[PDB]
Design a protein around this ligand. Structure first.
Ligand SMILES: Nc1ccc(S(=O)(=O)Nc2ccccn2)cc1
Length: 284
């Protein structure tokens, strides 16, 4: 029975290697990674891979791995797929831990923009969780942490992390991680998956997919929001993506809204992540 080697980049940046039978469905690999991670609250997570165009795709757990990675390497990343709106409602601390590690990468990468003060506060909770109480013996006036806190590090940010870290004496790791999450969950781009698109007039916009619905970023003024309940049908055709926007009270007709995506694969990808979010956050 022939088996393919899988390499998975974990959220701590380490590599997990395993073998699965070559006709295996994605769920097989995902189950092995989650067992390795001692993760029980698996519903919020998934594996990603890079397609022949180098775009991040979710590995569909119900489909054969080989029919998704196709010509590409069996290389994956473990990631948060559905960002819980209230991480305090998760049942296990280890779930909140992996969500923290993902968010730390969202921040360093710049996918999750963050004010100076929030970068420092999040950083201070990470340091408290990972090193425990502030120790002056490690931190002089010239201290720079090994922890990546931000897309661009400054001495001022390092100083503010230490100042806040001092305030957290006695805080346990689960407690610090919960504080991290109570702050992160409030950020306007928390758990927003962004897709480049054009509106029906060719004006470049961003579509964001998240727990609350679909977001349209036209300019810094005028951000449109479609709560999942207000969406009845998600569809794609060629390079186009469409949502059916339920009739408003006393309106005769549903309204259909149309976008142009970079190519057909990008329209299908956006359709699938929208359907999956609609399903997940209808049931939550
Ligand atoms: N994770 C997340 C991100 C953004 C938003 S929202 O504040 O824009 N609110 C809404 C409300 C309805 C439809 C779309 N966004 C909410 C949650």
């Amino acid at each position: 029975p022939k088996s393919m080697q899988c390499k998975v980049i974990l959220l701590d940046g380490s590599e997990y290697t395993c073998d699965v039978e070559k006709r295996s469905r994605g769920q097989v690999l995902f189950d092995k990674v989650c067992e390795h991670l001692n993760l029980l609250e698996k519903d919020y997570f998934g594996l990603t891979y890079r397609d022949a165009e180098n775009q991040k795709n979710w590995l569909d757990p119900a489909k054969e791995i080989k029919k998704q990675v196709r010509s590409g390497a069996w290389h994956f990343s473990f990631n948060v797929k559905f960002y819980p709106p209230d991480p305090a409602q998760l049942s296990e601390d280890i779930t909140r831990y992996y969500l923290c590690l993902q968010l730390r990468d969202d921040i360093v990468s710049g996918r999750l923009p963050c004010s100076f003060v929030t970068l420092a506060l999040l950083g201070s909770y990470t340091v408290q969780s990972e090193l425990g109480d502030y120790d002056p013996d490690e931190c002089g006036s010239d201290y720079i942490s090994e922890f990546r806190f931000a897309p661009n590090h400054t001495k001022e940010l390092e100083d503010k992390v230490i100042e806040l870290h001092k305030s957290h004496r006695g805080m346990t790791p689960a407690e610090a991680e919960m504080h991290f999450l109570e702050n992160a969950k409030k950020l306007s781009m928390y758990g927003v998956d962004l897709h480049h698109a054009k509106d029906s007039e060719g004006v470049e916009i961003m579509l964001g997919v998240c727990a609350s619905g679909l977001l349209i970023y036209r300019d810094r003024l005028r951000i449109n929001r479609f709560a999942w309940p207000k969406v009845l049908k998600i569809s794609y055709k060629r390079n186009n993506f469409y949502i059916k926007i339920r009739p408003g009270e006393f309106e005769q007709f549903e309204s259909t809204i149309g976008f142009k995506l970079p190519n057909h694969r990008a329209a299908k990808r956006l359709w699938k992540v929208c359907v999956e979010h609609h399903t997940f956050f209808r049931l939550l």
